[PDB]
Amino acid sequence: AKKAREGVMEFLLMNHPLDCPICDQGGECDLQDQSMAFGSDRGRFTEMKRSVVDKNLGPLVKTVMTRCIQCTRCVRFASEVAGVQDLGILGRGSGEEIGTYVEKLMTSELSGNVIDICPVGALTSKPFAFKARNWELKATETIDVSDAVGSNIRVDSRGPEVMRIIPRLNEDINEEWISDKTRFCYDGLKRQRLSDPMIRDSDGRFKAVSWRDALAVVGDIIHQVKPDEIVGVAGQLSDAESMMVLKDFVNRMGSDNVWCEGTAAGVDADLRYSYLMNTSISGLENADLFLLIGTQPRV
Amino acid sequence: VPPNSANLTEARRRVFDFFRAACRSIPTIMDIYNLQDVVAPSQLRYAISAQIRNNAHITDPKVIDLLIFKGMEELTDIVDHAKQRHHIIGQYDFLKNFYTSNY
Amino acid sequence: FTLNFGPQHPAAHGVLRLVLEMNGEVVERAEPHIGLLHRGTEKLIEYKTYLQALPYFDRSDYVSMMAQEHAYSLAVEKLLNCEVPLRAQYIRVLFCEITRILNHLLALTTHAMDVGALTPFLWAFEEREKLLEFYERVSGARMHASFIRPGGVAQDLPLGLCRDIDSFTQQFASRIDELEEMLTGNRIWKQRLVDIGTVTAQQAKDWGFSGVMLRGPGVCWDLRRAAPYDVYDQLDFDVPVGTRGDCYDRYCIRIEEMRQSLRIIVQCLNQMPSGMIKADDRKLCPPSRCRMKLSMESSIHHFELYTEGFSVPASSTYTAVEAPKGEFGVFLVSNGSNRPYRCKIRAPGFAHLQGLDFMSKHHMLADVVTIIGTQDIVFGEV
Amino acid sequence: LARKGTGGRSSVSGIVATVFGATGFLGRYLVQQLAKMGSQVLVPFRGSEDSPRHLKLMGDLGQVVPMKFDPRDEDSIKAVMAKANVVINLIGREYETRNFSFEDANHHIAEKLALVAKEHGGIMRYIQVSCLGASVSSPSRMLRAKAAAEEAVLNALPEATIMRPATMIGTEDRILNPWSMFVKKYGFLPLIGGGTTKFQPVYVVDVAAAIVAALKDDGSSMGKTYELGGPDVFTTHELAEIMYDMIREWPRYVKLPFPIAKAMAAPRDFMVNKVPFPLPSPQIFNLDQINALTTDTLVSDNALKFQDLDLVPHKLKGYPVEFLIQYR
Amino acid sequence: RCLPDGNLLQTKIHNIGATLVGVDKFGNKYYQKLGDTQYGRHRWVEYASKDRYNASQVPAEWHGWLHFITDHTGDELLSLKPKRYGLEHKENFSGEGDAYIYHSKGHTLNPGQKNWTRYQSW
Amino acid sequence: GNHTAKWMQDRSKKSPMELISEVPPIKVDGRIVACEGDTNPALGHPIEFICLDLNEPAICKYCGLRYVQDH
Amino acid sequence: IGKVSGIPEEHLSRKVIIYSPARTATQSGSGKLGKWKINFVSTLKWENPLMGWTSTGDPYANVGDSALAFDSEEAAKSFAERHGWDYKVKKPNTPLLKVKSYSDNFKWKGN
Amino acid sequence: KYSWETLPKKWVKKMERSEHGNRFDTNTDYLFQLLCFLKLHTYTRVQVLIDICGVDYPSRKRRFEVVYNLLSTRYNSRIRVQTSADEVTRISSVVSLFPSAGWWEREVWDMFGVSFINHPDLRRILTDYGFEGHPLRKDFPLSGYVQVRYDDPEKRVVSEPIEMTQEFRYFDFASPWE
């Protein structure tokens, strides 16, 4: 068994380019961690490795197919889980090349997870082009709030900013896959952020006053308004706590006009089946027939 | 010193022993570090008692033994000129937090 | 009567902060104060890989650098089972022994400068600036040569280093003779050292001296004869062992141990096999620059050995070599991970400087610097 | 301001200050406050580069950037205040020097820094530091100048805080350290005017804590001339009574009528005459400090005190005077 | 000569038998007195700035030959200095005024003090 | 450039990006090149085999050098 | 054992999270699972304005991840409860080894 | 090994190894009694306490593990008697047998907190004077809690405020597949 493993890990590292320093997945690599653990310490191949051009797979998956070992994991992921069927194992022999035969950006969402699927640097996040390394990133087992599926997540942060948002196993919501809305929304958290409480001056532009002044002006303007005229529209990303605090605030202010951003007029939030996915997101695996009433669940 | 604290009783006995030791040593403390004018003996006794009472809810005997040992260490390093004096003088609602930070 | 005897000459014994409880001029007890040089070495090593851990060892004892890297390497080969070549062993000893010479040349004549002889210091330091032309040539840094890596040794000698070490060994018996003719015969030396800090063997054993302070008392105990940890079982050398234990025996030993180290240098030179420099196990030894660039499987190891590390298997060993100060041993518990786990460093000078309390009882206050002299107390290890 | 930190010594406070008088007794406490609450300090020094060396510490790696500048030459003051949002002014003298006269060191500079900060639009808070009782028609030309400085810094730049610290005590001060080292004239203390002066000293740490507290405050404390008086309104003789408690010496005062003093300080007032030689900085007998010593106007009136900064000063007994122990 | 106020006199007491091996651009005359005696003292440099000299004025072309690391006089490594990115020496202007001294990109003395806040404010 | 405007504040010495975008692409024979580094395979980067099937020059990621098929 | 441990008072009212680090999604290898780690949130990290590097103020910045890794939730909870931290244990999500075979790729779609 | 036959079975209580240096992981009560054996014994003569290595296993229940090394200059052998004592268990001190244990046990208490019974002068040896906290534990952060020290208006004095520094960057090198 050990000789078979060493044999194969020599073949894989035979036509494989020495891209480990410039490979984005240099630290987090199955090939590096299997060669450094089960593969042989030396390589006898001293000849001309094969090389492969870099296919354009869109603004998400940076592709360096020379590194790719043609294990076919991604061409299976796009055909089965992602279900879009764009990737392919074009050609035969060592000349095998993985990707779309015609220049075809991976129009499918959910196809940014091919990077976690990929056991090799080849398919890597182009947004996370090279910005960090597998060891710098301090990982927090956060969740996601983009879409209401509430997929699990690892916010790989280096210091004060979010370098890379990577999924993590939670078989009951998202097995090991997260939408491209969640993988690459981390860039938002550092752009156009509001960082100072700005009130409006006597002109029309903002003025970054401190917190005392902004809270004072807001408090005064709620004191000088009719109670039934207060409304508390709560954002779509707001947590449960701040929505509870918003409810308890605009309530004791004499109003009952707090509501989430998406729920239109007259929602029936009495019985909890009326706004839940009663069958678990895992429960849908036992379903025989689906009736997606509108709902466009791919989107 | 062996932990004769096979019960809270012996531990409390040696707590009182350490308290008497610190109290009867306050003279040299006030002398070496010159607190006989800024602090009163009542106040230093008050502080030692507030220390021994702040950690009074220790139903574990060995933890009390170790606390008394840390206290004896602190005292012995205060009696002698091992530590300085500018700490000995120092050793002796939501909105107001929110305005400062996020934590 | 308490006296805060500090560093008499700074830059020689750096942070020496004894608190002597005297009796006139006779010292009744010497209470050394440690921690003034307590860098977080036994904590910082738990946080870094086995490769990043090595540079701390040349910074543990600052006058005998490579002996501690050699004691660490032999503690991450005791676990790794990492068989190193013959050339790595011979170079590793030719530099552990050059380090014994670099230390005795300092710890004799810095001691002899604390006693008062000003010139042996500067002659021995010209000799040391000749040996740092070897350290600096073989690795790069004159003092901290992070050169004796876990598997084997960092990189081969330059193509002119054995010729120069020979041209130095030929002229080094004379330098020892001068250091000896200037100090051994002197009646102002013997008087300053004979019957000073006499340690009966039971005391040198009790207080775990295990160095040149365990062979003063007459205990024939050298961990190069007891536990031969390299070619030492092949190399011929006689361990000089004192007969009285006084600081004049430990000096005579350190000045003979500086000749037997010359024998070991000349042997390591005359028999140095042209073999590989590092262990062939490229998962414990980063491959050469030429190979990792040309070979993909070597590049992967150069990446997982300069970032990940060895991940030496789970064990716990106490590897102790005969460093110049004494038995420098590094007790290296190793969790399976690539970072060590409580790499405790038994360093002589923590056991020797304990001996100052009983060595310098009833000795005159001016002797308390002679004791600190012959203990070779270097506070990096304390 | 744009604060991103927790405490200081590595935090940020959005205060890139230029404490004009940092290389001075008040300056070392103010710079330490501003750079221990984690904010940049552009300490500008006048001469020897050894002046602000004691300020390269107390600030973390560029939180204190000592800079060179000529007091009379602008385009250098503008360079020191290039990257700055706070500009404190501690540039003041108690003694006329042959090169810089009382106005050219107390008033004609504070007005100049005020103007060249006004031009450099962006100086949010400009604190102006002048002695208490520095009102026009005060005898000491130092206080008349320091009053004109206030009037010209407020005019040329409104919403500019003006601290009015009274004589400040502390280590390396100009009030107690001259009396000691004159008690080293065998306990002989020449309290002038008979100690009838009523002045309110203040621990320099608390003057600094007030100068920073008007920075951390809101839009208030702008254009409002505080009076950093302190507690325990003293008299010169009574203050000397506390020195002899710290330095182990027996009180051996003498009284000096004001004519006798002004005659004893009649020399060292030819500063503009003796050109080829600078005089040795009159420490205790200063004709202008004596003119100020005459009238006990150095008491905090109903103007703003430490209470309007949520701040209460330390006493003058105990630690805030324990710098005298080094004289025992 | 005319400097009895420096150790430059020790160098000028050398050169009595020494041969001059090349001279770099700055004027530093690089001497060699081998064969005679005292290894380690057979290669030096006369800084051609008899006052205000200091170390590190020796360019990289010679800083090898002069520390005995190599045996290639700077007149031989000057055919190896890279033309595309080659840069002249800078004497280590440490302390000699700002804009000569080096500055990081936030020092507030560096023209163009960059802001490190990773978040782009609104 | 803009990336190079983050670490280089000199802006008078040509930015490395331009120094490499102004060197011409190297003609070769086969469909795979070596680009071992400058010249000495031990003083250059790990050997990076580049594919020249495309018409446009294929840059070497480590060194920026560009290779074309030269059929 | 919180008071005898010398830890300052303000760092024993800390709120920790005793999780088990999930598998790095990028690499399909379970050699880093089952090592429960206390997670002192330690979120406060600004950017030291002189140089581009960051600068924490919390002492417990790294030791949550580095060198403090237990082997079982019971030992980790016992640790965070001795020292008096307010631990909220976040259970690890483990994978279902659903039965799967090769011959299911070549399934017959009847007709 | 001869030492295990003669030794009372109860003294080598918990464990015993047979390579990488042999060890007798004993119990804290039988420790100084076990250290009395192996010394002052004709066929086991150690006489030399080389080292006392505190080792902290946070995931154990008896956190620390006071690893007494022991050299036998007579028979040329090295035995590593161990123990296990948590943060509040005073362990027997062997300064009475090997007087070198004085400073080693001061260091074990300083670094870890394993107080030693009837050890005369059991006082923090390595860490700072006013040091609170035990460094070589695991839960003690590398950079320390309050261990920055800078000069200030409290002249001639270096304060001890809360600590702030470039964040120690912990790198997660550890790879899967072990």
Ligand SMILES: NC(=O)C1=CN([C@@H]2O[C@H](COP(=O)(O)OP(=O)(O)OC[C@H]3O[C@@H](n4cnc5c(N)ncnc54)[C@H](OP(=O)(O)O)[C@@H]3O)[C@@H](O)[C@H]2O)C=CC1
């Ligand atoms: N000291 C006291 O008891 C009292 C002082 N004050 C006021 O507090 C402020 C600071 O006090 P303190 O630091 O003790 O005063 P100092 O007299 O010690 O001078 C402090 C600073 O002023 C600078 N300075 C003074 N004159 C000039 C000048 N002509 N040109 C350039 N720089 C100058 C000094 O530069 P350099 O060091 O190079 O000379 C130094 O940086 C002053 O406004 C002072 O009048 C308030 C109450 C009383």
Ligand code: SF4
């Ligand atoms: S995938 Fe990338 S990091 Fe891994 S072995 Fe291949 S080139 Fe190296």
Ligand code: SF4
């Ligand atoms: S998953 Fe990656 S390595 Fe596997 S075939 Fe696809 S591109 Fe190649």
Ligand SMILES: [Zn+2]
């Ligand atoms: Zn290239």
